[PDB]
Paper text:
A key group of these are the respiratory chain supercomplexes (SCs); these which primarily consist of complexes I, III2 and IV (CI, CIII2 and CIV) in varying stoichiometries, which serve as the minimal functional units for NADH:O2 oxidoreduction. Here we report in situ structures of porcine respiratory SCs, determined directly through imaging porcine mitochondria by single-particle analysis combined with cryo-electron tomography (cryo-ET). Our structures, with an average resolution of approximately 2.5 Å and local resolution up to 1.8 Å in the best regions, enable in-depth study of mitochondrial respiratory SCs in their native states. Our in situ structures also capture numerous reactive intermediates within these respiratory supercomplexes, shedding light on the dynamic processes of the ubiquinone/ubiquinol exchange mechanism in complex I and the Q-cycle in complex III.
CI orchestrates electron transfer from NADH to ubiquinone and concurrently translocates protons across the inner mitochondrial membrane. The Q-binding site in CI features an unusually long, heterogeneous channel structure. Our cross-classification results indicate that the type-A SC is the most abundant form, determined at resolutions of 1.8–2.4 Å in most CI and CIII2 regions and at approximately 2.75 Å in CIV. The high-quality maps, as demonstrated by discernible ‘holes’ in the side chains of aromatic residues, the precise positions of pyrrole rings and the Fe atom in haem, and S/Fe atoms in SF4, enabled us to build accurate atomic models of this form. Previous work has demonstrated that the lipid bilayer can bend to adapt to CI conformations. Consistent with these findings, the membrane enveloping the SC exhibited noticeable curvature, varying across different regions.
Author numbering:
A (entry chain 1H): 1 to 318
B (entry chain 1B): 25 to 179
C (entry chain 1a): 1 to 70
D (entry chain 1J): 2 to 175
E (entry chain 1e): 1 to 99
F (entry chain 1K): 1 to 98
G (entry chain 1A): 1 to 115
H (entry chain 1Z): 49 to 144
């Protein structure tokens, strides 16, 4: 039965990724006075299937200068991390219930930077390596703000347990208590998934596709699935962290509906950023992180350590 | 018999391959702007599943939109070679078709079909975005009638 | 126009709803119709281990009340 | 399932043999992070949840990550491979066989005396029997860094600030 | 310390982590608290030279508590002697030891 | 002692041997140093958790942070050497023989 | 152990997706097809292109900041002590030292992507 | 609002902790008998297993001190089924 | 007067992020030392009963230790109920 | 009540295509379920529709025949199937069918 | 160890504005020199014109700046008319100015929107390419071709405007400023667009003059010069 739980978690997530491709294309199209996929199936509903089928029957050109061991290990690591990021998530009850769930997510997402450091190195070409190094530096630099923002927010939670976030946000959203940290967290999440003006590793008009140039068909498809799973997962984490839904122990379907709707709204906002802004330069986003986000994050961590102590509002640790 | 299963599988694979025709933006000259007009909202090539793609490693069709010069032909053949298969070439405009206005020039190759095999020849100088869209749908119908698995079953 | 984006969003919503509902219902099924007991600390684990021993059926969630002895 | 910490420790030592035989530093780093992951698992099996997750987040996702990033810049024109040297194979093979011989001896004898006396009676055997109550003893011990460990915080923070100053002194290159 | 600044200035800089029988958070006990306490109370103020011989029993008990080496030997003997009689079909473990 | 301790101490010995037996690259030796630190971390953690030395739970954190500071220093030294010679090869670090 | 089963399933399914992805398509490969992509020409290997001290410096500064973050992670449990004034003093001390490291790197060029 | 709520969550935790405190004498009394019964059952078995080992003497404390020593897992479950000792060692750690 | 006001003006006009961060950090530094509630937080932490309250033997002359949990002796949490 | 009228207009699009089968036929052939005014039918089976309240470029359309010159064209249609008489009206070179 | 990355490529790159080989060496992150390699679209136009009659050479100018077709053919027509000592009629001149300004709208839409798309603001490209499609319709209604009208000729224009064309041009133009507003609502004040354009590619006015710059590349540096005013045609 637990195996069935794992399967009924993984497979719907991959399906949601597949149709997130369609949803993103349609949202971009309608923001651009066009339609997007509306021919292949009703309202493009069979388009993700067409993409998945075409990709797995397309020739996966592997580079002659590629260390194939890591060339295939990188997609495995990426997709395995992208899937395992959902196992502690408290759609009302988690698959895996840990004391340190958000710490587990921080660690697992920090292991995901290897899939770029290994793909760029394995692909050789002597230039995709530079794009991979830029991506890794961006990822590790925004890990700092992710970690510190999570630390400051959880000082109202009292623990690293994600189920406790539901209890913490019973009467009020955590957004009303930490909105500046919410904006910085949301932009950090944007930057970590290489999205929006932070998509420097796959700049369509900067370096064509960067670290993913040599990957084609199948491994490219799995990398794409990993990225979109990470996008939906990060938006789910954001919804649980800042927009906690009311929970009825006798009707958890209500919480699930609430959470899914809020996660979809945040994902649609992620696609909304993509259609509205130009692209940051690499040094420009590094400057943003290091000289704008980091000082405010340090100050707000200070503030959120001081605040529960000076108001006798320290949460329980149980 | 077992030729019905092979025919159905061929139909499935050829529906998936023409429903996700991802082309490569080879905009050489004036024909490039009518192709991004077929990209524009009025025609919206994305509604057919025909996305705005990137590096030839994820492209299924080459659109030669513009004059090919002698200085430029080796690069066109290089990126054609780098396309994974199955791959198709659409020649768009008189210049790419057979040289066009510059047919008798010292520096112009007379038709991209001297460099690459071409599947569809879209006439016009430039062809209207609707003409290019017609060529794209005609290419889609070419893919629909391929019989790769039925060829294999009778080998 | 824009409401034709809604079918893909509905498919996404169903695919995202499935995991949470499945987790809740599997937890109810395998825990005696009640919520899966949470043991973050050794005291809760010891509570569950005592529960398993006294149930006689080696299941912590079979609850013995005052009908068992008193 | 009966033995989990022993497979984890044997794999730990195997990874140590792998990266300490020193192939090209990218494969050495891969071996080091495999060893770090299995060691984080080892200390997870001992109840050190926070410590193992620290291993992960800071060692494998921090320190390593930085190591592989820096190797990706200062390497060879053809970055080497494990196979390229017979010395790597010899060192790895000798380490693997000295692992196998000693684990077999300890398993079937339980009184080896390689420097230290050892008894492979199990690994669960040394665990004590008791309740930790309503808190993690590890977390309470580590959170005491700010109440009991004032001096430790002072010296560690000073050393980290000095580390920033020191790195900026050395790398200036004049 | 080479220069006992702590004992001159009355400061507790690192003596609090120096033994496991020192005060602990939430009064969580060390595993070998009593053994360490007895060895420390034996060896207090008589010098290391005297404490090495005159507190040997307490330190031996402490070391056994820390690394249960002799306990492990006795358990290993019981285990392997049990098997020594399973093969011959001599000893049947009782119901509460099999389920 | 239990056999996990045996394998952890064995890992430390292997890392020490790998560091003492050099090869061309400096990064390989630094990785051996890191392995030595990681084995020390795990040994300390096992000893501290097993004996329930609660205040000593923080010692592995301190060991990890200080050893990572040393690793940063060594990485900077390697980078300077490489900028001098284009490689991190230790055989170029021999001009102090005279 | 449930978590081990979950990790095994995730890794196994990812590798199976590799196997279908990397063996199912029909292949026909020649030399010029798999040549490295350089926008229509051949790439130059040159000699160890990934250089510049700034890429290494950001990694080192991230490492040191990550170490201080490791020092900050026990904070949610640290607020549960009776001796709250000492704990607050030390947590704020650590954060001032983080801010001081950032400021010192900032003022002494540091974080800059120079010429 | 968070002040109000976190203040309420602290009294609820005090109530839960006091429920545990009230229950603790029962659990301590039970654990003592359970541990003593397991130790004595091991003793009764080893009196049989060790009959023929020549210089063996059963019940012999490894420690010089006659003070009560809390047994390890090996002394408690060293003669029981792999599932039981696996539970007693890793059931809490693995429970997720 | 005008010098510090002008510096604050320039900082607010060109580096609002640093102004906000320094003000927030300064308040986080300063405000806890003035709060009446910091002592309350200390008291709440002290009143959380993690351990068992192991009893004492009344040797006589223990008139302030309760005897029973519901005797009018020993600390009271009535203050916490209304806070 | 305006969303009520939007839903009514959709439902009348279902009814305006002669039922659900006809609605799905035009949904899956033309990827469009608008109901226009029939201006005429050519000898090849193509039907031509105008709706002057649509914006320019959508106010006129053809639902292609399913059979033309011995070729099945239920799914496989193209703009070359429009005869020159209707080609002029369809591309708005004139206002007269 | 000077290994300045000599990435001497990028023709197939989507941001290469068509066909452009860039030979680039960087001192780490920053550009040290740019070496544009052109000729990838050299078709021998100037030699072919020598084999063409004066009328036969006019369509060659549509395909030089294939974003500003009618302006190129206006320039060629003005040159040929100056050599012929003849004068186009007033109505033809007004039509030429009107379609030159329509052409300027087309070209500026293409330039600004493709600049933004290369920077990473893809959305304004589509909104304005709809207006470009409408102006293509104007081109085709006057000449039968959407891009290469060949409409402005030495002596005037080929044929007169069809009835109702001025009304449609008026209908389009009365709404176009709202689209410029929407384009500016996305770019002009955006802190990311300005970060990618402010103080980037600064050219001195005197150095702009000595490098042969013209148009916006001159007036960007404050030079008050426009051929439509100083040397009107
Ligand atoms: C493909 C690459 C995948 C990389 C990541 C692999 C998973 C790592 C995380 C494992 C789970 C975890 O840390 O949970 C923390 C969490 C932390 O929270 P927790 O431990 O408090 O959870 C609740 C536990 N109680 C009830 C005691 C409070 O713990 C768990 O989820 C379970 C703890 C026991 C786990 C026992 C098995 C550990 C196996 C570790 C991995 C070993 C192999 C590593 C890779 C080796 C590669 C060669
Ligand atoms: C009693 C109360 C005490 C506590 C008070 C706490 C402080 C209150 C006042 C602070 C307000 C500001 C908070 C931080 C804001 C960001 C800081 C920063 O550097 O900003 C400027 C920075 C830098 O701006 P800049 O570039 O103009 O300035 C840089 C510095 N100078 C001025 C010197 C040039 O800008 C950004 O961060 C831009 C982000 C780009 C992406 C934009 C995304 C748009 C969509 C957002 C949607 C909503 C997000 C959240 C969604 C929901 C999530 C749950
Ligand atoms: C896996 C099952 C594979 C079954 C065989 C292949 C598929 C059917 C044949 C090929 C496709 C049809 C074709 O070629 O053209 C269209 C065909 C016509 O092709 P045709 O080639 O026969 O037409 C020839 C004649 N002309 C062109 C002139 C008309 O039309 C159809 O209506 C076919 C419908 C087939 C079934 C469609 C099912 C849709 C999906 C339903 C489930 C939802 C998706 C779930 C996916 C999984 C999610 C986890
Ligand atoms: C998400 C995706 C999940 C997995 C989805 C799997 C979908 C499976 C349906 C069929 C997939 C395509 C099968 C055919 C491969 C492409 C093709 O047309 O090959 C033609 C080729 C043609 O071979 P050939 O020998 O005639 O030509 C090759 C030689 N040249 C090119 C020089 C002429 O077919 C084969 O090579 C044999 C195919 C055997 C049958 C395979 C059936 C499907 C097996 C998987 C199920
Ligand atoms: C410059 C460094 C300044 C550090 C902060 C100043 C001292 C903070 C403080 O209250 O420390 C209390 C602490 C502890 O005293 P305490 O009064 O908080 O008592 C703590 C009691 N336990 C451990 C049970 C929680 O001071 C020290 O430990 C002194 C260490 C040396 C400080 C040298 C500073 C120079
Ligand atoms: C996911 C991982 C891979 C799964 C593999 C297993 C499934 C394989 C089959 C996938 C779908 C095949 C569709 C068959 C072809 C097809 O329908 O062609 C359209 C064909 C037409 O094909 P066509 O070739 O004429 O192309 C269209 C041309 N015009 C626009 C001119 C008509 O039409 C139909 O078949 C009509 C019915 C469509 C199918 C029913 C869709 C129902 C809604 C499903 C939504 C998605 C699930 C939720
Ligand atoms: C207590 C029990 C022992 C504890 C310690 C662990 C022992 C087992 C693990 C060994 C770990 C790895 C040992 C080898 C390390 C290594 O990289 O040695 C390199 C060394 C010289 O390398 P290099 O100069 O590059 O050779 C010429 C290349 N053209 O290579 C050589 O000089 C050649 C020999 C290579 C293999 C030597 C292995 C020796 C292991 C035992 C001795 C050291 C301890
Ligand atoms: C009334 C209440 C107070 C109001 C605020 C007063 C102080 C305002 C902030 C300080 C402004 C100092 C002047 C300034 O603008 O410095 C800018 C300067 C360079 O900035 P840069 O963006 O690199 O520009 C380079 C040139 N183009 O900057 C530098 O060169 C270095 C800047 C270093 C900043 C370090 C910040 C660390 C984190 C601080 C927040 C966390 C809390 C720390 C403790 C705070 C205690 C108060
Ligand atoms: S065919 Fe005509 S429009 Fe196309 S590139 Fe050639 S000259 Fe330009």
């Amino acid at each position: 039965m637990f195996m069935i739980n794992i399967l009924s978690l993984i497979i719907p997530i991959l399906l949601a990724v597949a149709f997130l491709t369609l949803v993103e294309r349609k949202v971009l199209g309608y923001m651009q006075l066009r339609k997007g996929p509306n021919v292949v199936g009703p309202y493009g509903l069979l388009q993700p299937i067409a993409d998945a089928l075409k990709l797995v029957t397309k020739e996966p050109l592997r580079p002659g200068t590629s260390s194939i061991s890591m060339f295939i290990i990188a997609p495995i690591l990426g997709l395995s991390l992208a899937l395992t990021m959902w196992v502690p998530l408290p759609m009302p009850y988690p698959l895996i219930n840990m004391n340190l769930g958000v710490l587990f997510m921080l660690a697992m997402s920090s292991l995901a930077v290897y899939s770029i450091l290994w793909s760029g190195w394995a692909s050789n070409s002597k230039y995709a390596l530079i794009g991979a190094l830029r991506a890794v530096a961006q990822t590790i630099s925004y890990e700092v703000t992710l970690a510190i923002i999570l630390l400051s927010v959880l000082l109202m939670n009292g623990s690293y347990t994600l189920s406790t976030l539901i209890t913490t946000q019973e009467h009020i959203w955590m957004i009303f208590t930490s909105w500046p940290l919410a904006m910085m967290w949301f932009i950090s999440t944007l930057a970590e998934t290489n999205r929006a003006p932070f998509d420097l590793t796959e700049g369509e008009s900067e370096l064509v596709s960067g670290f993913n140039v040599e990957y084609a068909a199948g491994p490219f498809a799995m990398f794409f699935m990993a990225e979109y799973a990470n996008i939906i997962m990060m938006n789910a984490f954001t919804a649980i962290l800042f927009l906690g839904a009311s929970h009825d122990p006798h009707t958890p379907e209500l919480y699930t509906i609430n959470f899914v709707l809020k996660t979809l709204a945040l994902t649609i906002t992620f696609l909304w950023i993509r259609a509205s802004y130009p692209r940051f330069r690499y040094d420009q986003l590094m400057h943003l992180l290091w000289k704008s986000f980091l000082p405010l994050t340090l100050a707000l961590c200070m503030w959120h350590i001081s605040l529960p102590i000076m108001t006798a509002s320290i949460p329980p640790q149980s | 018999r077992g030729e019905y299963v092979v025919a159905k599988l061929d139909d499935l694979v050829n529906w998936a391959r023409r429903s996700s025709l991802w082309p490569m933006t080879f905009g050489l000259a004036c024909c490039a702007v009518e192709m991004m007009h077929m990209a524009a909202p009025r025609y919206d090539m994305d509604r057919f599943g025909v996305v705005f793609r990137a590096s030839p490693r994820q492209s299924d069709v080459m659109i030669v939109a513009g004059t090919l010069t002698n200085k430029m032909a080796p690069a066109l053949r290089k990126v054609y070679d780098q396309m994974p298969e199955p791959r198709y070439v659409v020649s768009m405009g008189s210049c790419a078709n057979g040289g066009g206005y510059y047919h008798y020039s010292y520096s112009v190759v007379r038709g991209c079909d001297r460099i690459v095999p071409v599947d569809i020849y879209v006439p016009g100088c430039p062809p209207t975005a609707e003409a290019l869209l017609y060529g794209i749908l005609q290419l889609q119908r070419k893919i629909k009638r391929e019989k790769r698995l039925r060829i294999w079953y009778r080998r | 126009m824009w409401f034709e984006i809604l079918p893909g969003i509905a498919v996404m919503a169903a695919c995202l709803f499935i995991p949470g509902m499945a987790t809740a219902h599997i937890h109810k099924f395998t825990n005696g119709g009640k919520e899966k007991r949470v043991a973050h600390f050794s005291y809760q684990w010891n509570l569950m281990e005592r529960d398993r021993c006294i149930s006689g059926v080696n299941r912590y969630h079979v609850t013995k009340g005052l009908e068992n002895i008193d | 399932t009966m033995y989990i910490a022993f497979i984890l420790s044997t794999i730990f030592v195997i990874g140590f043999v792998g990266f300490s035989s020193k192939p090209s530093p990218i494969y050495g780093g891969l071996g080091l992070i495999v060893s770090g992951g299995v060691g984080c698992g080892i200390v997870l099996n001992f109840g050190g949840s926070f410590l193992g997750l620290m291993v992960f987040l800071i060692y494998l996702g921090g320190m390593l990550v930085v190591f592989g990033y820096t190797t990706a810049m200062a390497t060879e024109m053809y970055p080497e491979v494990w196979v390229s040297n017979k010395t790597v194979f010899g060192a790895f093979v000798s380490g693997l066989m000295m692992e196998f011989c000693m684990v077999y001896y300890a398993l079937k004898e339980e009184e080896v005396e390689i420097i230290f006396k050892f008894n492979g009676l199990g690994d669960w055997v040394i665990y004590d029997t008791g309740d930790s109550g309503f808190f993690s003893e590890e977390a309470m011990g580590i959170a005491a860094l700010y109440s009991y460990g004032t001096w430790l915080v002072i010296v560690t923070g000073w050393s980290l600030l000095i580390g920033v100053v020191v790195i900026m002194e050395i790398t200036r290159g004049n | 310390p080479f220069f006992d600044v702590q004992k001159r200035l009355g400061l507790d800089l690192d003596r609090w982590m120096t033994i496991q029988s020192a005060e602990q958070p939430h009064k969580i006990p060390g595993r070998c608290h009593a053994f360490e306490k007895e060895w420390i109370e034996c060896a207090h103020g008589i010098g290391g030279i005297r404490a090495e011989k005159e507190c040997k029993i307490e330190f031996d008990d402490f070391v056994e508590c820390l690394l249960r080496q002799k306990t492990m030997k006795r358990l290993s003997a019981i285990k392997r002697q049990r098997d020594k009689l399973i093969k011959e079909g001599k000893y049947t473990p009782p119901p509460h030891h099999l389920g | 002692m239990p056999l996990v301790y045996m394998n952890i101490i064995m890992a430390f010995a292997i890392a020490l041997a790998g560091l003492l037996m050099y090869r061309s690259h400096l990064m390989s030796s630094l990785l051996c140093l890191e392995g030595m630190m990681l084995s020390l971390f795990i040994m300390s953690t096992l000893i501290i958790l097993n004996t329930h030395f609660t205040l000593a739970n923080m010692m592995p954190i301190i060991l990890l942070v200080f050893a990572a500071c040393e690793a940063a220093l060594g990485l900077s030294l390697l980078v300077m050497v490489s900028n001098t010679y284009g490689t991190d090869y230790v055989q170029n670090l021999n001009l102090l023989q005279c | 152990m449930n978590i081990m089963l979950t990790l095994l399933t995730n890794v196994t399914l990812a590798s199976l997706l590799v196997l279908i992805a990397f063996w199912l398509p029909q292949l026909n490969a020649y030399s010029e097809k798999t040549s490295p992509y350089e926008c229509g020409f051949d790439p130059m290997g040159s000699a160890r292109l990934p250089f510049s001290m700034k890429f290494f410096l950001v990694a080192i500064t991230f490492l040191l900041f990550d170490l201080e973050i490791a020092l900050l992670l026990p904070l949610p449990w640290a607020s549960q002590t009776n001796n709250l004034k000492t704990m607050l003093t030390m947590a704020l001390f650590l954060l001032i030292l983080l801010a001081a490291s950032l400021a010192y790197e900032w003022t002494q060029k540091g974080l800059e992507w120079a010429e | 609002s968070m002040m109000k709520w976190n203040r309420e969550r602290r009294r609820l935790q005090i109530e839960d902790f006091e429920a545990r405190i009230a229950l603790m004498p029962l659990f301590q009394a039970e654990k003592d008998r359970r541990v003593l019964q397991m130790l004595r059952e091991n003793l009764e078995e080893e009196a049989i297993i060790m009959k023929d080992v020549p210089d063996w003497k059963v019940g012999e404390s490894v420690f010089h001190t006659t003070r009560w020593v809390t047994p390890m897992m090996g002394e408690l479950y060293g003669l029981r089924t792999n599932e039981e000792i696996l539970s007693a060692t890793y059931g809490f750690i693995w429970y997720t | 007067a005008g010098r510090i006001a002008s510096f604050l003006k320039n900082a607010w006009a060109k580096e609002p992020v640093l102004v906000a961060s320094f003000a927030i950090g300064g308040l986080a530094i300063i405000l806890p030392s003035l709060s009446p509630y910091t002592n309350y937080a200390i008291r709440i932490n002290r009143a959380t009963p993690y351990n068992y309250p192991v009893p004492l033997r009344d040797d006589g002359n223990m008139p302030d230790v309760p005897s029973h949990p519901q005797d009018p002796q020993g600390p009271s949490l009535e203050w916490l109920k209304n806070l | 009540m305006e969303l009520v009228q939007v839903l009514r207009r959709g439902l009348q699009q279902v009814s305006g295509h002669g039922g659900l089968r006809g609605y799905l036929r035009v949904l899956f052939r033309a990827n469009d379920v608008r109901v226009g005014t029939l201006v005429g039918e050519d000898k090849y089976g193509n039907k031509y529709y105008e709706d002057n309240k649509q914006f320019f470029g959508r106010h006129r359309w053809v639902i292609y025949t399913t059979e033309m010159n011995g070729r099945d064209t239920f799914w496989d249609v193209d703009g070359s199937m429009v005869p020159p008489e209707w080609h002029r009206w369809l591309h708005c070179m004139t206002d007269d069918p | 160890l000077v290994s300045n990355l000599t990435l001497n490529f990028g023709p197939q790159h989507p941001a290469a504005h068509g066909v452009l080989r860039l030979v680039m060496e960087l001192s780490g992150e920053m550009v040290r020199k740019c070496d544009p390699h052109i000729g990838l679209l050299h078709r021998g136009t100037e030699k072919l014109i020598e084999y063409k009659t004066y009328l036969q050479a006019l369509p060659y100018f549509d395909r030089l700046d294939y974003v500003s077709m009618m302006c190129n053919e206006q320039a060629y027509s003005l040159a040929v008319e100056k050599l012929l000592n003849i004068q186009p009629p007033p109505r033809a001149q007004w039509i030429r100015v009107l379609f030159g300004e329509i052409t300027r709208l087309l070209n500026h839409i293409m330039a600004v929107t493709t600049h933004a798309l290369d920077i990473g603001a893809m959305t304004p490209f589509f909104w304005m390419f709809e207006e470009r499609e409408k102006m293509f319709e104007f081109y085709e209604r006057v000449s039968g071709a959407r891009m290469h009208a060949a409409y402005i000729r030495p002596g005037g224009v080929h044929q007169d405007l069809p009835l109702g064309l001025l009304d449609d041009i008026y209908e389009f133009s009365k709404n176009f400023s709202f689209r410029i507003d929407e384009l500016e609502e996305m770019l002009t004040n955006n802190r990311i667009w300005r970060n990618r354009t402010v103080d980037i590619g600064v050219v001195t006015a005197e150095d702009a003059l000595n490098y042969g710059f013209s148009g916006v590349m001159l007036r960007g540096s404050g030079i008050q010069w426009d051929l439509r005013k100083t040397q009107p045609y």
